[PDB]
Structure formats: C-alpha cells, structure tokens
Amino acid sequence: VAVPMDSTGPYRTVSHPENAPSGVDAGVGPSEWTHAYANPAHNAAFPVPDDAPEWIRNGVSWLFPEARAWPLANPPFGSKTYGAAEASVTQTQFYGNALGPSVVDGVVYAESDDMFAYAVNAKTGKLIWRASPVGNNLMGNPLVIGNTVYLSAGSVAFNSARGLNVSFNGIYALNRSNGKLLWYFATPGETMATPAYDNNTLFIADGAGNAFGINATTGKQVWKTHVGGMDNMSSVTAYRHNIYFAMAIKPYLYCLNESNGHIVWKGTIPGAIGDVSPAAADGVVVLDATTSNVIRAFDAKTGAVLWTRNMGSPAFKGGVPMIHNNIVYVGNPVASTYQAYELKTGKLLWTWHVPTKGAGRSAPTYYKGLLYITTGQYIFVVNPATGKELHQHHIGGQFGIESPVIVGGTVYLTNSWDWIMAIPLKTIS
Template sequence: MFKYDILLIIMIKMDKRSRNIIIIIIVVLFIGAAFAGGYYYHEPIKKPEKKYMEYLNGIPVCDVYYKNNLKNLLITGPSSYIEYANNNSRDNTVNGNLSARWTLKQSDAFEDNISVFYKDFKELGYGWIPGYTQMVGDVVAPTIVNGIVYITSSDGMVYGINDKTGNVIFSLSVPSSIMSETLVYKNIGYVGLGSAFFTYDQGLLNAFGGGYRGRYSGLTGILAFNATTGRPLWLHLTKAQAMPTGVIANNQLIWDDGDGNIYSMNLTNGNTIWKYHYNGSANMASLLYYRPMKLIIAGFSSGYPTNMSAFVELYTNGTLYKIIRLPFAATSGAGDAVPAIYNGNIVDTFTAYPVYYGPELKEISIKQAFIVASIKTGKIIINENLTKRFHVGGTNNGNSPLIINGIAYVPSIIDHRIIAVNVTNGRILWKSPELSVYAFLHDEPAYYNNMLFVPDLNNITIINATTGSIIANYTTNYIYAIQQPLIVGNTLIEDSITNYAYAVPLKDIIK
C-alpha cells in the first residue's frame, strides 16, 4: 500500500491541470490495453496461419490451415464418408439442421460470365463441352463429414470449409488434378490424383474400344491428409490416373485407376496390401462395396484390341469372385459410369451397341443402355435401350443412376433429359422435358422430398420425382459439369467448373 500512498500524495500536491493530464493518460492507456486485448482474443484469424509443406516421394504438397475458421461449425453430416455419395444407391442427401448461405470464391476462380461459354460453344461445337467441363474447376460433388465440407478441384486443390460460414479451414495444394470425391475415415481424408487428359494415341485407342487414361499425363496416385487441418500424410503413386472415388472396406483403402489396376492400401501409411489387374481401363468407375458378400465391384471399360468391358467382383482379399462381361458396351462407357446397387443387383447405364463409321468419336453411333445384373450369379437380368442412336461427338461417358425406392433416375446426355426407370422390370416410367442442350448430364441428381435437383448448365432444375415435370429453375452465375448437388438438412451445397462453391437454403431454390 505504501507506494500507492506516495503516488496519491504526489497527485494531491500537483496543480489541477497536471493532475487532469495524468488522469487522461492513464484512462487512454487503460482503454487501449482493453481494446488490444479484446481484439487479440476475438480476432485470432489475423494471426499468421499455419502452413505445412511436405515432400512426399520427393513431390511438394502444401497446406495452409486457418484454425480460427473451425469455430461455429454446426457438426452436420456423417462421422465418416467411405464411398461415392457415401452409399450404394448414390443418394447424396444428409439429414441435419443446417440452414446456411455462403459463397466461396476459390483461389483459382475464373470467368463466370455465361456468355463466354455460349460463345465458345458456337465457335467450337458441342463436342467441346464435355471435354472442357471435365478438365477445369470443380467437377465432382462436395462431401461433408462432421460439419466440414470438402471440395476438390481439377486445379489441384482440396478445400475444407466450415458448413455454417463457408470460411476456409484449410486449402491443400498438389501438383496434379483431383477428380475424385473426398473420402474421410477416422479423421484422415483421401483423394485420387490424375487428369482426364490423355495423349492423341490414347484417344485413338479409346475410339476403337481401348486405351489407358492418364498414363503419361502427369502425377497420379492417392493422397492422404489430416481431415481437420489438411496436413498431407502420405502419397501412394500409381501408373495411371486415380480419377474415380475409392472405397473404404474391411479397414482397407481400395482404389482403381486408369491402367486397369485395383489397389488395396493400408489406411495409415498407404502401403500396398494387394493389387489386382484386369485387361481394361477403370477410368471414372468409382468402386462399389457390397457388404452382404464383402465384395468390391469395379466397372471396367474396353481393352485393346478386344472389348473387355465388364463388372469385376473381388473379395476384399483381392481374389476374384466373378466377372460379368459387357461385350455390347461402347468406348469407355462402362468404365466412366458410376454404378449403383439395388436389391442385390448392379444397376448401371452407359453407351452401348456401337456402329463404327471411322476412328473418330463423332463417327461412332451409340445408344444409352440400362443394365441390371445379379451380383451373386453374374446374370444380366435387364438390358434395355433408353435412347435412339446418337453420334458420340465429344463424349464417350456413361451415366450414373440414382436409385430411390426401386426407381432409377438416370441422366441422359443423348436425350438431354432425366429418365425414370423401374429397376425391377426396366420399364421407362417417364422422361423429363428436355433440359439445356448445353448441359453435360452425366452425374446423378440429388433427391429431396420427392424432388430431383439436377445441375443444368447454369441452373439447378427441380423435377417432380413422380411425374418428371419441372417444378422450378434456380438460375446461378456458375456453370456445372458432373457435380451431383449435396443436400444437408435445409441447405443445398454445390460447386462449379468456374471454381466457386456455395450454400443456399432450399426454400430459396423451390419458389
């Protein structure tokens, strides 16, 4: 107390003006200290972010982590994400209480003026669209685990995003394209690396019914990272693109790639457990895991010089169970479509019954087939044509069905429609009105409350799932390729080939 008494005596003996100056200085210093302390406490985002630079197999992988943006997560979504759309029916809808609105402009975001797209289309033709939309920006659906939304980009980026705010939690950069959805298990994320690009010679092989994709077009493999911070953990290199989405089954990470290999890897270090090779090209056929029989199912496209298209079923130890041959499949259709499972059967739809007028894609005439095959017996139960003949043009992809209550909702780039098919008998129930002729209708719609949400060029078109009629069109500034929308609670989350992602309440889409 003695020192404070001396200070008080000194201030009393001072003249009034001097005392006031000292009091003002003390008050200012106190307010400044309080403000600085409060700012430091409430705004740690201004602190330098954490940066991880790893060299995996000598390859640089860089991550930037913004810890503060983990705040305000709603913790919606599943606790793990172990296969494409996280289920066998390919239904990318998650229950929850999320009601969010945000827009994320990614680091490589570019021109979102739709008129530029139309101009290029008119100058370069329809065949330009499918190639363009697979090679740039975000080309697969967002995923979500424990409130973190994961977005991958062909520009070599993985983003972890706060589901409520849209703020970036981490941004992971790799020197390659990423065209797979993000798998997450026990707080480790997994993505496949590799581009849809291939050489001219490979393209000719595909036109004739074979060829490996991405074998000589850059870094290819599977990358693991910390699912909260984005910090890279390990890289498993492959000979060709690992574009499809893998599957986590029986405590293994299983992935297929463009040179006909299926790899099983240790989840924690990436070491190979087993490898199976089939004389075909897996391309974009994301894997299925049929739990009752513990089987991994892959769709393979043509091999060269013989058409080796097939569904290949493996036990989880890598030994073969059954091969279901698809000799009527065309080009890489069976390997590009993502199949589904319903009632013990594989359900798929892809280009088929080719007529070749020459080696170029535009000289091949095909139909779109709808296939149902028994997993157990290997017998093809249903093989129906959904469309008339069509010249492939710039695309040779299959189409991926969504199955809800025994109905397959199938996108068709040939008809530019959504087609509803009874899975039990193959009967077409309805075809939607024609959507945009510019749209690349490849991936499944999303299903919510008897409505289908369909990416349609720069629209999300909402279709009545019972009748096929159009309910509404939600127009955006963004262009879509093969992204299936993600619906979480009361919110739709989507990304685009112009490197934008957004969340919007469903009530604003359905008006």
Template sequence: MRLIRPAASLVTAAAIAVTLSHAPASAAGQGEWTQYRYAPTKNANVQAGQAVFTGAIPTAGEVRATPVVADGTIFVGSHGSGELQAFDLATGELRWQSQAPNWVHSEMIHSGGRVFVGFGNRFAGEDGNRGTGESGVLALDADTGETLWRFDTPGEVMPTPVLVGGALYAVTGDKHLYKLDPATGTEGKKVPLGHVVSMSSPAEESGILYFGSGTPEPYTFFAYDTAADDFAWTRHFGEFNRGLDDVPPAVAEGIVVTTANTALPPDVFGTPMEEHTIVAMDAATGEVLWRDRLGAGPAPVNNRSGAPMIHDGKVFVGSPTTGTSYAYDLHSGQRLWNKYTGPVKAAPAASGGTVFFTTTAGEVLAMDAGTGELTGRLSLDGVLAPAGPVIVDDTYLVIPSQSREVVITRIDQIPPASWGATGSLGSAGSLDNIGGYLGSAEGLVGSSS
C-alpha cells in the first residue's frame, strides 16, 4: 500500500509562490555548516531556533546533495543542471538563484557569509581522470548568490569540500587534494593522491580528513592531517574494487567507518553481482577494528554509497546492494539488528531514539534506533538518493528528492506504521529480523536502483 502525503503538512508546488528575492539572509539559526552532512558523525541534526516552513519546495533540478540549513536559509544545488538556490527557511520562498558550470553533487557548505560548492560530472575524462567539461569549486555570497571566486580543476569535484583551520580542502576526480584560500580561491597546496575520488566527501575530525578513493587499484583510504599538511596514514584495501571512493565515511569516538564493494561473478541470468562490506578503522592508525559482510546482491546503478552514520554509540547504514538497513555497536562491531527496507544509498539521520532512512523507492522510514522496529512511514514521489535527510530542531525533517523538490515535514506528522506481516512495508503487523546477507537464515536480497 502506498501512503499519500498528508495534505495538512505538505503542499503542492503550485501552491508555493516562489519569487526571486535578494533579501539578506536572516541572522537567526545555525550559522556554520563546514563539512559533508554537517558533522563528522554524518548525523545532520541542526538547531535553527526559528519558524520552519513545511511543504514541498520546488527546485530547479534533481536534488542529489544534502540541503544545507544555515542562517535561516536552505541552500540547495541541482544535479544535472547545476542551478544553485537559496530558500528562506521560514517561508520556503526563493532568496536567490545562481548557476554552476556543471553537475552539482557537492553540498553548498556555509561559513562566514559565504557558501562553497564543488561541481563536475562522473564521466571518464582524459589521462584517467573522472569528469568531463568544466570542474572545480565556487565561492558565492550567501546573501545574494554572487560568485566571489572560481577555482578550476582537471577532474570533477563531486565530493563536498571541507573547511578546517582557515583553509578549504577539496578531493577530486583528477587524483589530487587541493588546499585553497577561502577568501580568494588561491591554491595553497596540491597534494597527489594517485587515486580517483568520486563521491567520498571527507569527514573532518580534530583537523584530520578521512576519505576513500578508487582507481587505480588497490583502492585506498586516506587520513590527511591538515595541521601537518601531510598524510597521517593510508590504508590499501586490495579486496575491494567498487564503492570505497563513493562512500563518505563517518567518524566518532576514535573510530572511522566506511563501506565498500567487491565484484562477484554474474548470476545465472547474467546480472552483475557485488558483495557489500562495512569496515571500522582506528582513526589514529588505520588499523581495522572490525568488519562485517552486509551481503551480496545486484550491482547498484551509478554509485554504491551505503553511507554510514554514527549516533549514540551505534552505526546505522543502509545498503543499495542488499536492500537492507543495519545497526552496529560502534566499538565491538556487533550487529544489533537488520531490516529489509529496500535499497538505501544515503546516510540516515537520528534524533533521540529514532533513526530516519530514505530509500531509492521514495520511502521515508522512521525506525526505533534500538530495535529496528518501524514506527512511521512517509511515501514521496521520486528517488531519495544519494542525499540523506536533515533534522532541524529535533522537530522537522528536511528531505531532498530527485523529483525536483525539497520536502519539509514535522516529524510528528509522519504517519505511524509497522512492518507488514509479509515483510513488505505495511501499516499493520510486524516481522522481526528480516534482511541481512545472502545465505543467512534471516536473509533476503533486495533489488537495487
């Protein structure tokens, strides 16, 4: 059964009178958003302390980057068309619109009255680089959308840049890490990586940048010390040949968590297959602390994601390979629960005892963080990937969609639900511990999209 959006909390695009405005951004609310999904844990849970619009805000194109909520404004970039937009958080009205030269998968991170965003596409370029056409980083005035500077790179900047220690860092499809002056865009340092980074936005914790990379093999994970301007450590993963460069890692309590894939032989129908694995490393040394096979399934399309999030000593992650969502103890690696949700690429978000997953089928699922029980379900139009939800004031959920909109709803307006008796997403009945990896007594393998 497909649930319809509650009319009381969501409105149609036609009902929103969106007008171009150059009014200055409100000083109210959270003013800094300096890395992918706001925090190293990747739990995008922010405090605004003001009125928040609820409804569907139409955007210029598909949204595949997390909306940034800062200073009373929602900053959104469009995927293939590259429009950059700022909306009033209280009214949903458009403050300004600007244009990037290429795709926007990067978040529009915000600091000091400026926003910074990467641009570029995923196509194979020259000399083994990733990205064709124009690629690079833009800085814009947060109040007006005026471009302040532009820095061009030979390969895509699809990962979200990060601000730390008075510098802006970006990893790229041309196998480099760039250090830029946030005020001028001047290059301070160009660090060779030797590997392409597709969408593994760096997680910054205590001045260290953590990110994964891809081709050429072996796929490699990096920890870069911004204070020393050198690598703290690198770790090769010879067993992985997909996805490590797609996944933005999460960091908390001295542990960094990521996921990656290994290509398997095609199934009997010729469908490409992969195995998905979660890995936790010591943030100081790169030593692998624990790992677990999430399972096998059809190879995901476009990106492997499976982006983890850490909250309250637990790791939450969904898999586009197995169609299952999981919870782990951060320190021991014990699997706490797994539930078949359908494919999830985005990092979830959590508030209190509830974690919110968004699926490629357009489902917003509220689940008990301790047990995995389904407590609420909202069905939206369009794919909800690879950008995940944002929680505002522990009251509102901001949901980016490839149906060209950002939906904002009160959490208490999400319709209650429970697992269906057949294991499907239903409004009655329950089914415990469904999901997991191929071959498990609990296991079901989901399709990917």
C-alpha cells in the first residue's frame, strides 16, 4: 500500500530478519494479543510452560532506546518552559510510549508517540523491525493476531471532534514478520484508543463519535455506528461477542453487538470518561472516571448498575481497572492510591497509598499471586491479600498508563521517555 514515504529515508520500514526468534524462542509468551493490556480483564500476566526456555524463566535484562530515547535519570524534557508535570505529560503524548508493550511468540511489539512501531527480540532486545506508515502519534499497544500487527493512529490535539484533520488517523495493519504495510483504514477522528480484535474483526471508536467494525483481513468496513461524543483513551473491550467502550463530551459507556454494531445498552458515571478503558470478567463490566474518582460496575448483558463506589478525593482522569479472581484492582489518581473491590458486591477489601515520592493511572498486573504496579518512576510489588507494599524497584523515566507485561520470570515494559526494556522478575523482588 502506497503512503507518503521516501523508501530510502528515515521513516522507511527497516527489518533485521536475523534478529527474529526461531524454534522454541518463537513459542515464548502468548500467541495473540487482542486488547489493550492483552485481554478484557486487563491482566497482562503470562505463566510459561515447564518446557519453556531457561532465559524467559530465569529472566533477561535489556534496554532498547526508541527513536526519541531520553535518559531515564533525566527530568522531563521541557520542565523549565512547561512545568515538570505538564512537561512529563507532553513528553508521554508526543515522544514516548503511552501504553505498555505486547509480547507474542518471543517478540516484544511497541508503538510510540515518536510515530514508530517497533518489534524487538524478547530475549536479546535487538531490533527485528521498525515502521512508520503514518506521520501521526501511536498511543496504544500493538494488537498481534496471527501474522498481522495492528496499530491505531491519532493525536491528543484538535485542529467537536478530537484529531480531525490533525495528521491522519485510523488503523494501520502491518506484516508481523517484516513490518511491511498491509492495509490501512482511515477514520475521520483520532483513534488513540486501542482497538479490540474478535472473530476476524477489529473494533474501534474515534474522536469523531464513530464506532467501527472492520474486517481484520481485508481492512474493509463491516459496520459504522455513530454514537457521538469522542473516544479519547478508552480502548475497546470485546467480551462474549459484544464490545464495550466509553465516550466523552456525550458521557456514555456503550455496549454494541459485534456483528452489526447495534447499541445494546448505555450507562453513565455521575459527574461527567472517554479516558478509561472498561474491563470485563464473569458477566460484569467495570469502569471508573474522575468527577473525586467514581468506580461503577455494570451487568455485561443489560448494563444494569451492580454497584457504585466513591474511591476518595490529573491529566488522565481515572485508573485503568484490572479484574482477577472476581476482584477489581484499580487506581485512584486523585488520591494516589490503589484499591481492591469485590467484583459482584462492591465490597472494599483494602487501600494502598502510593509512597509520596501520575500515581494510580495504570492497571496493576496480578502474576503468580502478587500485584505488580508501574507508576511514576517505579515498579512496586504489593500483596493482593493485604494491600501492603512488599518490594519497590526504581527504574526512572515515567510510566503514565503503562502496565507491567509479565512472562515467565521476565518483566517487559515501555517508558514515557521512549524506551522498551526487559527486567528479571527476581531483580524486582
């Protein structure tokens, strides 16, 4: 497919096939990545088989600079002129990674607001390919289905529709092996949200109020439902053949049928939302938004409110929820806390106050019985039964919306300072 490009220039697709994993190394981690944070529960935790190679289990340590890499010990670029907080947010949104990586078949995939997508060997950290089919920010995490990697393009800014005529938006489909551009589907508004893959279909909502089903093979539109409002960061969740996503300015959480895009139901959070990606498990969809910070649970099929809780009293307004064993683990960015709630009943099990040294935006990861949380410059280990901090490890840079991706004994991460990295799980504990 032809896009504006100098094929010999700095945006060209580069591929290093000798860095691609082979054999057992190409079977490490999941074989697909269908969601922001890998699945509807937003839990990026991946145990490995007994026969897994030793490197993934023992852990590997590497650091890969993306195109705009800034040293992790440095403060935010632009602090003097912008202020440190605003500088950090800007650097996240225009320079580095807003979400974490996707780890599939021995390869780490990431996309960056530096406008490149990357595929890097999960063992060695060496570049397998990089591509920049569109001159816009890539604010999600790559979807990886079979032999295709799916990116979505959009800007945080406005030229009401966000991203409309601010560069070019929509879904870009690349060849998973070499990064070559298979097809694109342009959208009127920005898609910073990550799409969802289900049943050979991609689902996305844009900042122009549009929801799309798109055939994941041909790239052609299946259906278009104009709900209104704008999806900013709320990544689509596909659960039991329906999709769920939130829109701002017209503040609704939507449930739509995958086959035709029919609106099954809508729900609200009092005190208007398009930032937070909903999570779904065991017939419940969970969403929270900053109003303080209010979390609400809905029946997946009907949208009936199961419970609502005020979490206590911020550029990204909400925490991304994660669900594990019928327990919601979610951050409150206003109080810099994390809380655990029973999924069905709304019963608060515990609260953890992040050490005083942007906290509470990211979904925890529940791996082998412990919680792992990347916020600020740190990765923390918290006991999920007590809510008490066990370990902490200083990394640097900033994690805005990033969640730890944990495979075997290895943690994979991106960073707002535009880095991809692998850290051993035992280094952290």
